[PDB]
Amino acid sequence: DPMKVTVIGCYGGFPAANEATSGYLFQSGDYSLLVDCGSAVLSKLFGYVPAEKLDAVILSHYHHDHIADIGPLQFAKQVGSFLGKGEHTLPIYGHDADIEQFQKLTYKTHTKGIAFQPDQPLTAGPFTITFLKTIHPVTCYAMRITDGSHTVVYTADSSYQDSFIPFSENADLLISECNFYADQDGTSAGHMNSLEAGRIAKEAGAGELLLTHLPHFGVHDNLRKEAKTVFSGEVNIAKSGFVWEG
């Protein structure tokens, strides 16, 4: 089975009109993993995959734009059980440096929070996930997701660090946050710009680069042109429905 990644939502902070914030659907064969679960992500997700066919969720961090739809997901599982659609508890993986946030992940027998350990590989069906702590105003982890043949790296949210380069080494697809333009400094907000995303893809030898966690001003296509001044491979701008498959 090939690894198939579908962007479900891609705005930073809050949704643009009729769009969504962070959510990425990773699929392999019958396995479905949702990476982050932000604003309007469930609404958009169910157009690709029904709640009962979702096998697991994993959360990079607990900012609203990455977890806003967890509650509604818990209710979706509850309604599924009430309608007889399967009682399998959906695992929701998250870090437990923030205990109060982690405790919200477990809802009756419908969803079960499981703490990932940042120094250990996590198995999720046919995927193996490893983690890198980001530089961000709350605890946040980037993820490297492989199925043994292809490898996708998701930066989650971060300002720039050299450690992203070894972490992302030889990734087929680097999904990098890019909340700021080339002229701007995202350090104080815990975000990166186009040049920084480009630098990671370049020095890591990423197969290609996908820019996401997008801003609500400017010409988004400029983020791609700016990234291409540094990285010579393929660079795309994320949108709901964007599909990568290898």
Added chain:
Amino acid sequence: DPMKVTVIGCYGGFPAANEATSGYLFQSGDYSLLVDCGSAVLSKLFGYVPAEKLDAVILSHYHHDHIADIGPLQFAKQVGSFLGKGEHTLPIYGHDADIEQFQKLTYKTHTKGIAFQPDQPLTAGPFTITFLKTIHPVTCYAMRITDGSHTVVYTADSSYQDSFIPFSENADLLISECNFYADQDGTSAGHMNSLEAGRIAKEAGAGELLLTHLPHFGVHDNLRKEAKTVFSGEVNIAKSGFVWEG
């Protein structure tokens, strides 16, 4: 100015594919009030009204399907201020029987939680709102919203009670939850069926009835036919984009 109500989202519990859960936009002249703020509501809302033009939010209760988008709304206000779009704090009205939930409404100088008092009229620009406690598994308040010429009643979530009849007396539009079909009993879930919604519209003399908080099974048009076996006025099924204006 006429009172204009736009349904932003109308599913109970969690969103159907490409839809939304509870959110209703009430407008009068330049004033904009959002009643409830559930899953995918911000995404859909911004297609009608940008965040910075939103004057107030009011929350019937703190179930996920009515508040999931509050966090992202707080970030939208923060990004608005960072971009220079106005620093006016958006008031978010809610009950304070649940203190922990009420405390989440205030975020820096961007949003400010204000406790409504259920026994007192609330002024919201040109609207006056009065409240009725519902029968629901968490504290919840129905709302009667008038501008002095027209009056809309929103049941929020509730199982049936006689007190809805005097509360909704002579409303031009009764927006009633209707999470269950005529053959089913919604009492143990704190919800109503089609016959119960119909009964309220009938005995209150409502100008018309709008059924919302919809289920994820069955033929939704049957809810309208069932309600019409009791109420002889106009009955519609809610959908995102539904507009009532008087």
